[PDB]
Amino acid sequence: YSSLTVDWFAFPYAWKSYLAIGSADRIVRFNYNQDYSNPSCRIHSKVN
Amino acid sequence: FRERAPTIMQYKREVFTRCNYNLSLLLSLVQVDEFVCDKITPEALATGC
Ligand SMILES: *[C@@H]1O[C@H](CO)[C@@H](O[C@@H]2O[C@H](CO)[C@@H](O)[C@H](O)[C@H]2NC(C)=O)[C@H](O)[C@H]1NC(C)=O
Ligand SMILES: CCCCC/C=C\C/C=C\CCCCCCCC(=O)O
C-alpha cells in the first residue's frame, strides 16, 4: 500500500448497529463517520 | 411504544397517511440491536416523502 490509516476507540459490542452503514443515530452523525471511499475494514474485537 | 406488546401470531399493523413524522424522537425511545433493510436505509427513512 501507499498508506495505512488505523482509527481506533473504545466502544461497546452491544452497539454494532450504531456504526453500520446507513445508520441515522447520533453516534455516526456527531462522533465518527467512516470514509467508505478507500478499501476499509472495521473490526470489532475484545482486548485482554 | 405505550401499549401492550402484541404477539407474533396476532401482530398489529398501522398505516400512516397524511401526516408528518419525526424519526429522531422514535430512535431515542428504543435501543436498536439490528436493522435489516432492502432498497432503503434508516437515514433515508429520516427524510423523504
Ligand atoms: C424531533 O424529536 C426530537 C427528540 O425529542 C426533538 O428534539 C428535542 O427538541 C426539544 C426542543 O428544543 C428539546 O428540548 C429536546 O431536548 C430535544 N431532544 C433531543 C433528544 O434532541 C426535535 O425537536 C423534534 N423535531 C421537531 C421538528 O420538533
Ligand atoms: C421512520 C419513522 C416512522 C416509523 C416509526 C416506527 C418505528 C420506529 C422505531 C425505530 C425507528 C428506527 C429506524 C431505523 C432503525 C435503525 C436506526 C439506526 O441505528 O440507524
PDB file of N, CA and C in Angstrom, chain A residues 14-18 20-26 28-29, chain B residues 23 27-28 30-35 41-44 46:
ATOM      1  N   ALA A  14     -22.423  -4.235  22.211  1.00  0.00           N
ATOM      2  CA  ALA A  14     -23.869  -4.256  22.034  1.00  0.00           C
ATOM      3  C   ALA A  14     -24.362  -3.202  21.052  1.00  0.00           C
ATOM      4  N   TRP A  15     -23.497  -2.293  20.607  1.00  0.00           N
ATOM      5  CA  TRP A  15     -23.879  -1.162  19.771  1.00  0.00           C
ATOM      6  C   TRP A  15     -23.281  -1.252  18.368  1.00  0.00           C
ATOM      7  N   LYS A  16     -23.251  -2.453  17.779  1.00  0.00           N
ATOM      8  CA  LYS A  16     -22.775  -2.584  16.402  1.00  0.00           C
ATOM      9  C   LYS A  16     -23.682  -1.861  15.423  1.00  0.00           C
ATOM     10  N   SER A  17     -24.982  -1.812  15.716  1.00  0.00           N
ATOM     11  CA  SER A  17     -25.946  -1.183  14.824  1.00  0.00           C
ATOM     12  C   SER A  17     -25.725   0.314  14.687  1.00  0.00           C
ATOM     13  N   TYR A  18     -25.076   0.942  15.663  1.00  0.00           N
ATOM     14  CA  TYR A  18     -24.844   2.378  15.624  1.00  0.00           C
ATOM     15  C   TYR A  18     -23.648   2.754  14.767  1.00  0.00           C
ATOM     16  N   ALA A  20     -23.079   0.667  11.790  1.00  0.00           N
ATOM     17  CA  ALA A  20     -23.342   0.073  10.491  1.00  0.00           C
ATOM     18  C   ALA A  20     -23.656   1.156   9.468  1.00  0.00           C
ATOM     19  N   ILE A  21     -23.410   0.835   8.198  1.00  0.00           N
ATOM     20  CA  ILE A  21     -23.600   1.813   7.135  1.00  0.00           C
ATOM     21  C   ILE A  21     -25.090   2.046   6.912  1.00  0.00           C
ATOM     22  N   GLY A  22     -25.465   3.312   6.745  1.00  0.00           N
ATOM     23  CA  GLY A  22     -26.855   3.689   6.643  1.00  0.00           C
ATOM     24  C   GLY A  22     -27.521   4.050   7.952  1.00  0.00           C
ATOM     25  N   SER A  23     -26.788   4.040   9.061  1.00  0.00           N
ATOM     26  CA  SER A  23     -27.368   4.379  10.352  1.00  0.00           C
ATOM     27  C   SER A  23     -27.674   5.870  10.440  1.00  0.00           C
ATOM     28  N   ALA A  24     -28.734   6.196  11.180  1.00  0.00           N
ATOM     29  CA  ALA A  24     -29.167   7.572  11.376  1.00  0.00           C
ATOM     30  C   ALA A  24     -29.000   8.039  12.819  1.00  0.00           C
ATOM     31  N   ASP A  25     -28.216   7.323  13.616  1.00  0.00           N
ATOM     32  CA  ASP A  25     -28.100   7.644  15.028  1.00  0.00           C
ATOM     33  C   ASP A  25     -27.152   8.822  15.244  1.00  0.00           C
ATOM     34  N   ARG A  26     -27.104   9.290  16.493  1.00  0.00           N
ATOM     35  CA  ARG A  26     -26.264  10.423  16.856  1.00  0.00           C
ATOM     36  C   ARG A  26     -24.782  10.085  16.835  1.00  0.00           C
ATOM     37  N   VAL A  28     -23.002   8.168  14.591  1.00  0.00           N
ATOM     38  CA  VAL A  28     -22.469   8.423  13.257  1.00  0.00           C
ATOM     39  C   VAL A  28     -22.527   9.914  12.940  1.00  0.00           C
ATOM     40  N   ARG A  29     -23.611  10.577  13.345  1.00  0.00           N
ATOM     41  CA  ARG A  29     -23.849  11.960  12.943  1.00  0.00           C
ATOM     42  C   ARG A  29     -22.892  12.941  13.609  1.00  0.00           C
TER      43      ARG A  29
ATOM     44  N   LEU B  23     -38.488  11.051  13.043  1.00  0.00           N
ATOM     45  CA  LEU B  23     -37.775   9.813  13.338  1.00  0.00           C
ATOM     46  C   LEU B  23     -36.754   9.973  14.456  1.00  0.00           C
ATOM     47  N   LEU B  27     -36.222   7.129  17.612  1.00  0.00           N
ATOM     48  CA  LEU B  27     -34.962   6.430  17.828  1.00  0.00           C
ATOM     49  C   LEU B  27     -34.431   6.592  19.243  1.00  0.00           C
ATOM     50  N   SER B  28     -34.870   7.619  19.971  1.00  0.00           N
ATOM     51  CA  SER B  28     -34.434   7.780  21.352  1.00  0.00           C
ATOM     52  C   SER B  28     -35.157   6.830  22.297  1.00  0.00           C
ATOM     53  N   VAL B  30     -35.994   3.751  21.767  1.00  0.00           N
ATOM     54  CA  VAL B  30     -35.555   2.373  21.612  1.00  0.00           C
ATOM     55  C   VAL B  30     -34.036   2.341  21.533  1.00  0.00           C
ATOM     56  N   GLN B  31     -33.481   1.167  21.817  1.00  0.00           N
ATOM     57  CA  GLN B  31     -32.083   0.863  21.546  1.00  0.00           C
ATOM     58  C   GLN B  31     -32.053  -0.198  20.457  1.00  0.00           C
ATOM     59  N   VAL B  32     -31.452   0.133  19.321  1.00  0.00           N
ATOM     60  CA  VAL B  32     -31.535  -0.722  18.143  1.00  0.00           C
ATOM     61  C   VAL B  32     -30.450  -1.787  18.223  1.00  0.00           C
ATOM     62  N   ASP B  33     -30.856  -3.052  18.127  1.00  0.00           N
ATOM     63  CA  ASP B  33     -29.918  -4.164  18.103  1.00  0.00           C
ATOM     64  C   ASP B  33     -29.431  -4.476  16.696  1.00  0.00           C
ATOM     65  N   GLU B  34     -30.336  -4.465  15.722  1.00  0.00           N
ATOM     66  CA  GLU B  34     -30.011  -4.813  14.348  1.00  0.00           C
ATOM     67  C   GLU B  34     -31.105  -4.278  13.442  1.00  0.00           C
ATOM     68  N   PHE B  35     -30.712  -3.698  12.314  1.00  0.00           N
ATOM     69  CA  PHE B  35     -31.656  -3.300  11.281  1.00  0.00           C
ATOM     70  C   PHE B  35     -31.278  -3.985   9.977  1.00  0.00           C
ATOM     71  N   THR B  41     -32.472   2.913   3.499  1.00  0.00           N
ATOM     72  CA  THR B  41     -31.667   2.977   4.708  1.00  0.00           C
ATOM     73  C   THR B  41     -32.442   3.760   5.754  1.00  0.00           C
ATOM     74  N   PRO B  42     -32.148   3.558   7.044  1.00  0.00           N
ATOM     75  CA  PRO B  42     -32.792   4.392   8.078  1.00  0.00           C
ATOM     76  C   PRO B  42     -32.500   5.879   7.945  1.00  0.00           C
ATOM     77  N   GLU B  43     -31.319   6.246   7.440  1.00  0.00           N
ATOM     78  CA  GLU B  43     -31.045   7.652   7.166  1.00  0.00           C
ATOM     79  C   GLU B  43     -31.932   8.186   6.050  1.00  0.00           C
ATOM     80  N   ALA B  44     -32.338   7.325   5.117  1.00  0.00           N
ATOM     81  CA  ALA B  44     -33.336   7.708   4.127  1.00  0.00           C
ATOM     82  C   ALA B  44     -34.740   7.713   4.705  1.00  0.00           C
ATOM     83  N   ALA B  46     -35.278   8.865   7.547  1.00  0.00           N
ATOM     84  CA  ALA B  46     -35.319  10.132   8.269  1.00  0.00           C
ATOM     85  C   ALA B  46     -35.843  11.279   7.411  1.00  0.00           C
TER      86      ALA B  46
END
